[PDB]
Amino acid sequence: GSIEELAKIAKKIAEELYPEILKEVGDEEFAEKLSRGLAIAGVALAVAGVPLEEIVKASPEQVKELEPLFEKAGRIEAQIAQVLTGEPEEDLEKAAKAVAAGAYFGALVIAGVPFEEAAKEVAKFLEGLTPEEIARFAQRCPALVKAAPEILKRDSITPEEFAKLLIEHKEELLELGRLGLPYLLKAYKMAKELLGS
């Protein structure tokens, strides 16, 4: 139950994802990051109670009923990430809201919410962060930077402008989410087993 214990689990799961991700991602630095992030999310979703095997089958209204569990998952993601990386040592509650938006966007897209509407729902989810905070958290995601490297020189991204960035890079972000989905599911299943021992 301790965060250190969840981090050790996520680190072990990341080691099982990494060789397979390397078979298909030629940037090995990006492969290392993907394997840690997908492992951390798999653990966080499992211990937050997001039913990911049901999400991939769910309707949009069923995904929206689960919205508070995604926010809990984001807080656990950011706490684990502090142990494994150190870097997210700051306002944890703000970082948690940002990362929460990631899996919740993907959950709405998986459920069949049209990409542009899902993007607006993300804009809604980020309200309360300053455009400067939004810019700084977006710059910490290697998938967003890989799809939209102009993030690297934005000082200010409003929630609406963040949704516009997702839409402008829809095809690239769909390809990264499709790459990550099988590894997220594998990590979630391994987490559920390891947590339940």
Measure the CA–CA gap between 117 and 170, rounded to whole angstroms.
12
CB of 81 to ligand HEM, least distance (A): 4
Sequence-distant contacts of 164-172: CB under 8 A, at least 24 apart = 164/119, 165/138, 166/105, 166/115, 166/119, 166/122, 167/115, 167/116, 167/119, 170/115, 172/146, 172/147, 172/148
In degrees rounded to 5, what are phi and psi of residue 146? -65, -40
Per CB under 6 A, contacts with ligand HEM among 51-80 are 77-78
Give the nearer residue to ligand HEM in terms of CB position, either 66 or 165. Answer: 165
Q: Kindly list the distances between the CA atom of residue 168 and the CA atoms of 98, 115, 144, 165, in Å, as whole numbers in the listed order.
A: 19, 11, 12, 5
Among 10-18, 44-52, 53-61, 170-178, the segment contacting ligand HEM (CB under 6 A): 170-178
The distance of Cα 163 from the centroid of its chain, to the nearest Å, equals: 16
CA nearest 102: which of 134, 135, 70, 150? 70
CB of 33 to ligand HEM, least distance (A): 4
Binding ligand HEM (rule: CB under 6 A), the pick from 6, 10, 25, 33 is 33
CB of 167 to ligand HEM, least distance (A): 12
Per CB under 6 A, contacts with ligand HEM among 101-160 are 101-102, 105, 137, 140-144
- Is 64:36 a contact under the CB 8 Å cutoff? no
Give the nearer residue to ligand HEM in terms of CB position, either 62 or 85. Answer: 85
Give the nearer residue to ligand HEM in terms of CB position, either 58 or 143. Answer: 143
CB of 20 to ligand HEM, least distance (A): 15
Binding site for ligand HEM (CB under 6 A): 33-34, 36-37, 77-78, 81, 85, 88, 95, 98-99, 101-102, 105, 137, 140-144, 173, 176-177, 180
